[PDB]
Amino acid sequence: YSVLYNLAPFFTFKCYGVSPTKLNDLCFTNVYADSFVIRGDEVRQIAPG
Amino acid sequence: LPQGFSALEPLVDLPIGINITRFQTLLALHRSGWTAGAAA
Amino acid sequence: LSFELLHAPATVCGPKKSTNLVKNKCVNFNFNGLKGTGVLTESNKKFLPF
Amino acid sequence: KQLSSKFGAISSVLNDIFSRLDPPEAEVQIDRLITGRLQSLQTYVTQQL
Numbered sequence: 001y002s003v004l005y006n007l008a009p010f011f012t013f014k015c016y017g018v019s020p021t022k023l024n025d026l027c028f029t030n031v032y033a034d035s036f037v038i039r040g041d042e043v044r045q046i047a048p049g
Numbered sequence: 050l051p052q053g054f055s056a057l058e059p060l061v062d063l064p065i066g067i068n069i070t071r072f073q074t075l076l077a078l079h080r081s082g083w084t085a086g087a088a089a
Numbered sequence: 090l091s092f093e094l095l096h097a098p099a100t101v102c103g104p105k106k107s108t109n110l111v112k113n114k115c116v117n118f119n120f121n122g123l124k125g126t127g128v129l130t131e132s133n134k135k136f137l138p139f
Numbered sequence: 140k141q142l143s144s145k146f147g148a149i150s151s152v153l154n155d156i157f158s159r160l161d162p163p164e165a166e167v168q169i170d171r172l173i174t175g176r177l178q179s180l181q182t183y184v185t186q187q188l
């Protein structure tokens with residue numbers, strides 16, 4: 001939680017779900033990290049619901 | 050099948066994460082053409 | 090990224106903090122990031138490996 | 140058993156909800172949990188009296 005953040009200038013870390021302040025007290029069995037690239041204002045399309 | 054109660058504990062769990070729809074069982078032929086023992 | 094729990098125990102946990110197994114006090118405790126009640130004493134019931 | 144019942148919530152444990160769900164959120168969830176428990180205990184008290 002410290003190598004992917006506070007290395008570059010600020011990212012667009014605006015998301016709904018798990019709290020950024022709750023990342024230091026949460027246990028998860030498995031994580032599915034998928035990476036992709038989009039164009040322009042399609043960030044809103046990547047959202048639950 | 051013998052008459053009795055015997056639970057089966059989970060020996061190991063495999064996170065294979067693939068589609069499985071058909072299963073095939075293998076056997077062996079004893080060489081000592083070949084002789085096949087009793088296997089029910 | 091998806092942060093979900095499954096039937097298997099959580100192998101990866103966010104809290105690193107300061108590892109300790111100290112006792113002989115009585116205030117309050119936390120286990121696996123989940124609050125609860127009870128005093129961690131001896132267990133005569135042997136668990137299965139899974 | 141009614142205490143162990145989820146009453147149509149995400150989980151029956153308040154501590155897991157507090158450690159996972161957003162602290163601004165889950166207020167409705169814990170409210171429905173406590174009012175279901177209140178209904179169960181008031182039924183128990185009425186039948187006991």
Ligand SMILES: *[C@@H]1O[C@H](CO)[C@@H](O)[C@H](O)[C@H]1NC(C)=O
Pocket residue numbers: 068069070
């Ligand atoms: C597995 O394959 C069968 C037959 O091709 C198909 O009907 C089924 O939807 C598949 N399951 C998954 C999870 O892909």
